[PDB]
Design an enzyme around this catalytic site. Structure first.
Site, short mmCIF file in Angstrom:
data_model
loop_
_atom_site.label_atom_id
_atom_site.label_comp_id
_atom_site.label_asym_id
_atom_site.label_seq_id
_atom_site.Cartn_x
_atom_site.Cartn_y
_atom_site.Cartn_z
N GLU A 35 0.87 -1.14 -0.22
CA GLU A 35 -0.17 -0.11 0.05
C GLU A 35 0.82 1.27 0.03
O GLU A 35 0.54 2.31 -0.63
CB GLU A 35 -0.79 -0.07 1.35
CG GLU A 35 -1.97 -0.86 1.01
CD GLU A 35 -3.06 -0.85 0.09
OE1 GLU A 35 -3.06 0.49 -0.26
OE2 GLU A 35 -3.93 -1.61 -0.03
N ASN A 46 -7.83 9.23 -5.14
CA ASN A 46 -8.51 8.16 -5.83
C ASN A 46 -9.34 8.93 -7.02
O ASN A 46 -9.75 10.21 -6.73
CB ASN A 46 -9.41 7.86 -4.98
CG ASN A 46 -8.61 7.15 -3.99
OD1 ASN A 46 -8.90 7.19 -2.64
ND2 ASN A 46 -7.95 6.21 -4.39
N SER A 50 -11.66 11.11 -3.04
CA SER A 50 -11.06 10.85 -1.85
C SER A 50 -9.40 10.68 -2.05
O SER A 50 -9.08 10.57 -3.01
CB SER A 50 -11.68 9.66 -1.35
OG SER A 50 -11.50 8.47 -2.44
N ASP A 52 -6.01 8.47 0.17
CA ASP A 52 -5.93 7.33 0.57
C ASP A 52 -4.46 7.83 1.66
O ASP A 52 -3.64 8.26 1.00
CB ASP A 52 -5.24 6.14 0.10
CG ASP A 52 -6.68 5.48 -0.75
OD1 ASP A 52 -7.54 5.71 -0.15
OD2 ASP A 52 -6.47 4.61 -1.89
N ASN A 59 -8.66 5.41 3.56
CA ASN A 59 -9.54 6.23 2.60
C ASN A 59 -10.27 7.26 3.36
O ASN A 59 -11.15 6.79 4.11
CB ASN A 59 -10.17 5.33 1.76
CG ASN A 59 -10.97 6.01 0.57
OD1 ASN A 59 -11.85 6.56 0.76
ND2 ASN A 59 -10.18 6.43 -0.16
N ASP A 101 -14.81 -4.60 10.02
CA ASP A 101 -16.30 -4.07 9.41
C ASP A 101 -17.02 -5.23 8.67
O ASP A 101 -18.15 -4.88 8.05
CB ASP A 101 -16.04 -2.84 8.56
CG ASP A 101 -15.50 -2.92 7.57
OD1 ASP A 101 -15.38 -3.98 6.74
OD2 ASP A 101 -15.11 -1.83 6.53
NA NA Z 1 -9.39 13.89 -0.67
#
Ligand code: NA
Ligand SMILES: [Cl-]
Ligand SMILES: [Cl-]
Ligand code: NA
Length: 129
Positions: A35, A46, A50, A52, A59, A101
């Site tokens: 990552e 992204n 958004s 990361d 995110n 989650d």
């Molecule tokens: Na952003």
């Protein structure tokens, strides 16, 4: 900070990620490697707008607030910049929420494509833990 492999493994272990939700430490190290290349300062935007953040590329649509992801949730209740710290605590704490989650580590695309199903223990081999 750019962590060394075993240094990150040790930090993740100290923060309780070893076998957290059943994911052995190597999975977390592998995820971090792909990552962020172990760089706590990694950011990546992204297509949806958004971003990361951090060693685990958490995110901003869901997990942290960066002030520029409209309609986004801050489920970890943290500014995304906290995820860039050389202290991985905030990233780890938020990652524990993510992995809990329901989708496990499949939330990390690099984990699903580059770690899942592989010998992830290799990532902690040799490390004093
Ligand atoms: Na952003
Ligand atoms: Cl492992
Ligand atoms: Cl799972
Ligand atoms: Na992170």
């Amino acid at each position: 900070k750019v962590f060394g492999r075993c240094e990150l493994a040790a930090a993740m272990k100290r923060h309780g990620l070893d076998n957290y939700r059943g994911y052995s430490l190597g999975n977390w190290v592998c995820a971090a490697k792909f990552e962020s290349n172990f760089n706590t300062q990694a950011t990546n935007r992204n297509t949806d707008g958004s971003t990361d953040y951090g060693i685990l590329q958490i995110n901003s649509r869901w997990w942290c607030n960066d002030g520029r992801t409209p309609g986004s949730r801050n489920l970890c209740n943290i500014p995304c910049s906290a995820l860039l710290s050389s202290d991985i605590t905030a990233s780890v704490n938020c990652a524990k929420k993510i992995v809990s989650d329901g989708n496990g580590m499949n939330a990390w695309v690099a984990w699903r494509n580059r770690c899942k199903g592989t010998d992830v223990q290799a990532w902690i081999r040799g490390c004093r833990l």
